[PDB]
Amino acid sequence: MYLRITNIVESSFFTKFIIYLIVLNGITMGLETSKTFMQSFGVYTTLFNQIVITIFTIEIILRIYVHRISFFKDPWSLFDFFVVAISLVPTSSGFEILRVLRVLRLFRLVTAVPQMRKIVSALISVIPGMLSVIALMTLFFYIFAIMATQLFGERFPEWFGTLGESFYTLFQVMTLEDWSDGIVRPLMEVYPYAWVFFIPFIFVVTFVMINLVVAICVD
Amino acid sequence: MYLRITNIVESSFFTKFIIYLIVLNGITMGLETSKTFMQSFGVYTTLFNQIVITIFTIEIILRIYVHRISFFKDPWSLFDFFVVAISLVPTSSGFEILRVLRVLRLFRLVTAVPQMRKIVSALISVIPGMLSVIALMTLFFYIFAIMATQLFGERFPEWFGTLGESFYTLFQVMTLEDWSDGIVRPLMEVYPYAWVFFIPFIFVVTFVMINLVVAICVD
Amino acid sequence: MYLRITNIVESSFFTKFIIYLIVLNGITMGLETSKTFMQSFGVYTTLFNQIVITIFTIEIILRIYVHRISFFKDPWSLFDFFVVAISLVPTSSGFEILRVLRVLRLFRLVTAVPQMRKIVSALISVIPGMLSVIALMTLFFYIFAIMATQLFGERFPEWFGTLGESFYTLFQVMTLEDWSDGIVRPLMEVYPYAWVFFIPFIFVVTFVMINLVVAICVD
Amino acid sequence: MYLRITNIVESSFFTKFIIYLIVLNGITMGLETSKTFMQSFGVYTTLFNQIVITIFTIEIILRIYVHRISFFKDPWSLFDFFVVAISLVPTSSGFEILRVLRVLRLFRLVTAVPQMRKIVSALISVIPGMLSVIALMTLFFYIFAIMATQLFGERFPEWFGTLGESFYTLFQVMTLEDWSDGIVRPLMEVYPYAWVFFIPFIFVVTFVMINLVVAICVD
Ligand SMILES: [Ca+2]
Ligand SMILES: [Ca+2]
């Protein structure tokens, strides 16, 4: 019976049937946004959802027989397994993010279509050649985040009171959003020289990011 | 008579005449901005406008005989067709953007001057090699927009109350404008962990956009 | 006497002397900023300043005898002429920006030092390959500035009331600065669909700009 | 005994022992952020710190015998030297940034690890090819800052009242942060034409900055 199911699974019909449910469930999930819609057709769509969730567990089960160990060493399959498993955890208990994380399944449209898969893989492949820069940065961030907390967190605890807060703030200085009027001009009312900490920080981090982009435009 | 008019249409004089009218009518449309000007020469210009509109329908009619089906397979001609058609709908009824859409005819300067066509065509040609990325993103936006509507739209309906609202907001976070002080620092006064949603969103979206630019700098 | 002066003008000592005054007069102009300094040594400075202006007119006079027509066909010499002429208009009357425009003579350090000249020239040379795009953009801006003036300038005259105002506003949207919370969200309180005008504008303008950067990386 | 120590110094154990202490001391400095932690285990960590500081001076001393003059011509060692010297200045007196500058020793992880050095060196090497541009900009900034101080610093002394103030403000305009709603729309309520100063400044400075990135993408 193995080859029987193995010919169903591997079939064009199967794959295209799954893709058909994804685009359907995805449309159905945008509709579950509308409180209007739900007051009318919410029963339809909760059951339709549980239906699709079964079909997807059935499918993921079949795919496991047909591939065995080959399956749990496939990134894309691992993804599908995990994303479906989230949708299995009862509509209750723990947190409610698990109810919301259900929408992550629409990423199956990426997993189950090679043109998407191509593009995604193309992107992700660029990551390993950045890890040296990324690591450099995280150290830099870590250092300055600590310095900031002990330079400004007493008078300015909203922003620098805690290591985490300094991280968040320093990230935001890095996107350059409201960094001057929102943060450094205020800081400078109390610490005239705070500009000596932030202008350099801005240069370094912006420099590094120019390099990282140009790095990727070599490979 | 076909070849008679075909020699008129194809003539350098004909084209340079049309181009001459565009620049004038374009100049005349920036004058129609001034309430001062309109109170003194408003009629001078409205008739000058109706004049140019006929001349352009006459031309488009002529250009059609000379080209027949070849015409409605030319992007640039199709454009001029649709744009002049807009200017034909009576100055009234329906919506009044149609009165405003009239200034789209100054894009005829692009269509009728070859150096412009080059650059426009240069630009547009870059789009197809972006479609797989652009599609990737749209799915991504779609998924996150839904996640935000159901995570922040009850307490924060201005910004996330509706699927489209979340779309607009997520775009603004992507342009990085007032994303922290405007949206996320606020959100975190109620949802301490909103940063776990928006930092990843900013990374992914910024990365993808760096790749797309680098992609273009390969092709 | 010609060759006598021609050997003085073309001398290393001459050039280095001029470069000396520039770096000196430039330091002088930053000190002229301090309200303190001026009460104390302001007179010292104004005479030293007029002295320098003489020397510079003498030089430019000499430089012309030694080059004649060749001089008024040199970009860099023309600049030096045009800048020194400005510093010649009495510190009185007309517009007083002329008193301010004087500091433009510190650009002579770019003109008199070759390494600078190289870099400037390197930059300027990139301009001609952008002119088709820069023209394209201006037309785009012109057309949209007009659409905006007649679409929002009645309720929003601060931002769109005039062709120029719309220009300025549209530029600011292009730098993406406070474009959503500062302008478009406001607009949308009255014109729910103003988003259909600004998102496309932002896409088009940012696309074009990515291309121009990549266009340069090609050339 | 020279070769005896030279074998200890050059030992993989020695170098890995140092890297081991850096990662601990770094972990320990993030815990020193928490006021809670300090009330409990603060005395633990002050000693642990002074311990490591001794060890690091011992190492730096040992490393000097083994390398002599070669050591004070090595960037990375010089650094290591200077960063520990800061950490030696008593926990008192002068300024107390010296207490804060102690966190710069975590940059020793960049020094002590070759994978990092590589990446850092890759970056720094790009600097020399930028100095002609950087010099140009600084001149440009200097000139404009002076032009701004004497154009807007009387009415707008918060932002342009001083040479330094103008510098900071001009920098902020250059990052394009809050530049229109925050600076130039205000300025223009009093100086209608202030736009004539800042739009060109934005163009020039953003142009140059595009080139600089592109320059690094050809080197
Ligand atoms: Ca902003
Ligand atoms: Ca604000």
Automatic annotation (TrEMBL), chains A, B, C, D:
Its main location: membrane. Residues 12-219 form the Ion transport domain. Sn-glycerol 3-phosphate 3 binds at T162, L163, G164. Ca(2+) 2 binds at D178. GO terms for cellular component: voltage-gated sodium channel complex. Keywords: Calcium, Coiled coil, Membrane, Metal-binding, Transmembrane, Transmembrane helix. It is a multi-pass membrane protein. One of its GO terms (molecular function) is identical protein binding. The chain crosses the membrane at residues 12-31, 43-66, 78-98, 119-147, 193-218. It is found in: Membrane. This is Ion transport protein.
